[PDB]
């Protein structure tokens, strides 16, 4: 009976490929042709944040575009005032090996996790004047890669055991589990309406998930190695990926196939992080060659370089109002660009 | 100064935070970090018990020196993704069980793992300590069963010394970075404290080399 099932699976895959080929009629490049280039982009460092004494792995902006949080190899979590480089809070961590951090939309909580397989919740606004931990989530059997708040009572996490989960903070229990991947899941991104999200894994595939239903809708392939970063488009109808084969690609939800590829012959190392601008016109990625490159989303040309770090670039993000950009590196410094 | 009282108080609070951060970093810089690697049933647990989630951390002090050791055996995930996190350790402790030779066989798996770890890009100048355990059981079983099963080319006499020397020589035959790193080989003793002394003596030379680099003479 196995042979019949395998033949049916192959027939279904051929049908899917034929349908995708039939849908494609024009290339993205031809549509966005005869368009004036954006020009050269030059930015300079406006702030430098000092105080970490080891490699930095993650950061996240606040919702008011003034406060931010970052995590480092030493067990420290720091909240920065960005207008004046003041340290609002400093949080010691029980476990030194962290990989991700998040800041709540309301502003009352932060979260982090790593090789301990646990996600921790910290309360910022208390009548005693100090920050303490409130909840710990302990379901996964692999290391945590990413996490994002939905509200003051919901959060979604990603793990290296090829699964994702949704939690209820008040009771500390899992509500839904997403099991479709084959390799380790590296990153996730939330939709603007918080009804959907996407993930990327080491099996060189990406999937789309429904939060309420808890079932998988679409699957995307094409990369030749592990996918390291993923990000939504501002209107929520596209997303971008970055992989170890030294390239980027763009996907469409309604078309359900690739549109554009961003690559260069001289570039050989992989990509660590990626993010979009406010308008969705610029694509920003960090690389292993100590540089951060600026890509046009509509075109396939390089638009700028942010060369100010002495080691690998780990993370990067953009404010809600679109004013400034932050980068972290393995040299233990944070920079604000504008 | 173009600042109000609130801003001045905020600046003072920030300075008090930087002071504590610097003090904590200076305190933490002095400790010694070790990474523990090995295959299944290789005697790692015995070594851990003798020397005083997904990651387990052990700490102890010996002769005015502070040690912290980490084992990641229960991760069971892709090692390439998180192996670079432990860059910067003083030395790596790698364990191999001699008795696991008749039972493909575990010895080839251990050799493959050792070759993979030794030639890694992250560990180019990191000294590696190689342990051999289960000596008594190996000696007992050697009389009953020859060692030629694992190594058909081996023609030495059926004695403990020659077999152990041949196995050790095969282990350091896999090194290809003899210039930067040194491999240390030891035989585990059950009711003894020679293992801790061996590790301490090994790490003292690494500390000396680091000081020589820092002073600028090297």
């Amino acid at each position: 009976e196995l042979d019949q099932l395998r033949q049916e699976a192959e027939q279904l895959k051929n049908q899917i490929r034929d349908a995708r080929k039939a849908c494609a009629d024009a290339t993205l490049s031809q549509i966005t042709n005869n368009i004036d280039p954006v020009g050269r982009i030059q930015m300079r460092t406006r702030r430098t944040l000092r105080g970490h004494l080891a490699k930095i792995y993650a950061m996240h902006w606040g919702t008011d575009s003034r406060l931010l949080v970052s995590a480092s190899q030493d067990g420290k979590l720091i909240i920065w005032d960005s207008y004046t480089t003041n340290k609002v809070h400093a949080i010691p961590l029980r476990s030194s090996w962290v990989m991700t951090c998040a800041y709540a939309p309301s502003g009352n909580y932060v979260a982090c996790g790593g090789l301990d397989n646990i996600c921790s919740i910290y309360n910022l606004k208390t009548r005693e004047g100090n920050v303490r931990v409130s909840r710990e989530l302990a379901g996964h059997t692999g290391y945590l890669s990413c996490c994002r708040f939905l509200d003051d009572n919901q959060i979604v996490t990603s793990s290296g055991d090829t699964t994702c989960a949704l939690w209820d903070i008040e009771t500390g229990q899992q509500t839904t589990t997403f099991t479709g991947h084959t390799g380790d899941v590296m990153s996730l991104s939330l939709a603007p309406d918080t009804r959907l999200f996407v993930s990327g894994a080491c099996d060189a595939s990406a999937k789309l998930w429904d939060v309420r239903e808890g079932m998988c809708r679409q699957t995307f392939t094409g990369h030749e190695s592990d996918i390291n970063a993923i990000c939504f488009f501002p209107n929520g109808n596209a997303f971008a990926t970055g992989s170890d084969d030294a390239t980027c690609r763009l996907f469409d939800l309604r078309a359900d196939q690739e549109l554009m590829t961003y690559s260069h012959d001289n570039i050989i190392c992989g990509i660590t992080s990626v993010s979009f601008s406010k308008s969705g016109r610029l694509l920003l990625a960090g690389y292993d060659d100590f540089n951060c490159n600026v890509w046009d989303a509509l075109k396939a040309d390089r638009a700028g370089v942010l060369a100010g770090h002495d080691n690998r670039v780990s993370c990067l993000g953009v404010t809600d109002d679109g004013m400034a950009v932050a980068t972290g590196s393995w040299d233990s410094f944070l920079k604000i660009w504008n | 100064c173009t600042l109000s009282a609130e801003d001045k108080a905020a600046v003072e609070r920030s300075k008090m935070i930087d002071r504590n951060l610097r003090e904590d970093g200076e305190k933490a810089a002095k400790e010694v970090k070790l990474l523990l690697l090995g295959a299944g049933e290789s005697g790692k647990n015995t070594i851990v018990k003798q020397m005083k989630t997904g990651i387990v951390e052990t700490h102890f002090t010996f002769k005015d020196l502070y040690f912290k050791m980490f084992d990641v055996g229960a991760q069971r995930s892709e090692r390439k993704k998180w192996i670079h996190c432990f860059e910067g350790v003083t030395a790596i402790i790698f364990c191999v069980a001699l008795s696991d030779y008749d039972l493909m066989n575990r010895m080839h798996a251990s050799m493959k793992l050792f070759d993979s770890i030794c030639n890694n890009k992250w560990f180019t100048e990191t000294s590696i300590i190689l342990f051999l355990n289960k000596k008594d059981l190996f000696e007992e079983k050697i009389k009953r069963s020859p060692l030629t099963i694992c190594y058909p080319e081996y023609t030495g006499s059926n004695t403990y010394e020659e077999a152990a020397a041949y196995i050790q020589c095969q282990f350091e035959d896999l090194n290809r970075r003899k210039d930067t790193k040194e491999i240390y080989t030891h035989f585990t003793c059950s009711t003894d404290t020679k293992n801790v002394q061996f590790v301490f003596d090994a790490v003292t030379d690494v500390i000396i080399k680091n000081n020589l680099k820092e002073c600028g003479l090297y």
Partner: single-chain antibody
Framework: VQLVESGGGLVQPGGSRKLSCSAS????????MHWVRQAPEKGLEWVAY????????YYADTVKGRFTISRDDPKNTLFLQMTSLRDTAMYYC??????????????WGQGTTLTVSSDIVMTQATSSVPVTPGESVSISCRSSKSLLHSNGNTYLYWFLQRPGQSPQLLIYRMNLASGVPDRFSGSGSGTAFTLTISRLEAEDVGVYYC?????????FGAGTKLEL
């Protein structure tokens, strides 16, 4: 959160006495502390201030040279040493914390009584205003200098002292505090300010005070009494 002050009593002129305060229920080492004074029939007056970590100390001109303020963070205790008494009034303890988005002057003390045998002016031009439940109330306080700073903050504060009780913060930086109803609202200009109550209640009977925190010293406005 508790703040209890002790001392007081009857003291002859030309004497010395020390007051103490004990903190509880919060991280005392992370807060600054103040002393504020109220005369038997007059308004509130500020006395002294000590910073967190003992970096900064301030005094008032009327009392400078004769008073001493010190803290003991291990024991969570506050002190005030007074010498050469001439000072019959009520003394209170106030905690305050300063960082981005913080809420200073949030908690006050019960108070103790002692009986002896170039500045910005706050003036309130209304007093003994009649009021009935269900009716809106508007109250204004005046200043001699602009409270608006270059960064963009207006440093005006509102307090309520119900009969027989210590003052309570209602509005800060001219932003509603935690634990008070949304009836109260705050708005104003560079030099003119007003406090509005949407619907009067029985618990709203008391005296209002306006205060400024732009620069030292700290000055209290006069009283504004609401009857029924």
């Amino acid at each position: 959160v508790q703040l209890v002050e002790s001392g007081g009593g009857l003291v002859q002129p030309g004497g010395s006495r020390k007051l103490s305060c004990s903190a509880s229920g919060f991280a005392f080492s992370s807060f600054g502390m103040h002393w504020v004074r109220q005369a038997p029939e007059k308004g509130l007056e500020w006395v002294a201030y000590i910073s967190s970590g003992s970096g900064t100390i301030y005094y008032a001109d009327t009392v400078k040279g004769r008073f001493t303020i010190s803290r003991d963070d291990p024991k969570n205790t506050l002190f005030l040493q007074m010498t050469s008494l001439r000072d019959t009034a009520m003394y209170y303890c106030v905690r305050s914390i300063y960082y981005y988005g913080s809420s200073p002057f949030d908690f006050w003390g019960q108070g103790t009584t002692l009986t002896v045998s170039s500045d910005i002016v706050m003036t309130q031009a209304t007093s003994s205003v009649p009021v009935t439940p269900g009716e809106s109330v508007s109250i204004s306080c005046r200043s001699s200098k602009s409270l608006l700073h270059s960064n963009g903050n207006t440093y005006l504060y509102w307090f309520l002292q119900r009969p027989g009780q210590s003052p309570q913060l209602l509005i800060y930086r001219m932003n509603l505090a935690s634990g008070v109803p949304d009836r109260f609202s705050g708005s104003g200009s560079g030099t003119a300010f007003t406090l509005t109550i949407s619907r009067l209640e029985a618990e709203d009977v008391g005296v209002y005070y306006c205060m400024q925190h732009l620069e030292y010293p700290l000055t209290f406005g006069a009283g504004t009494k609401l009857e029924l």
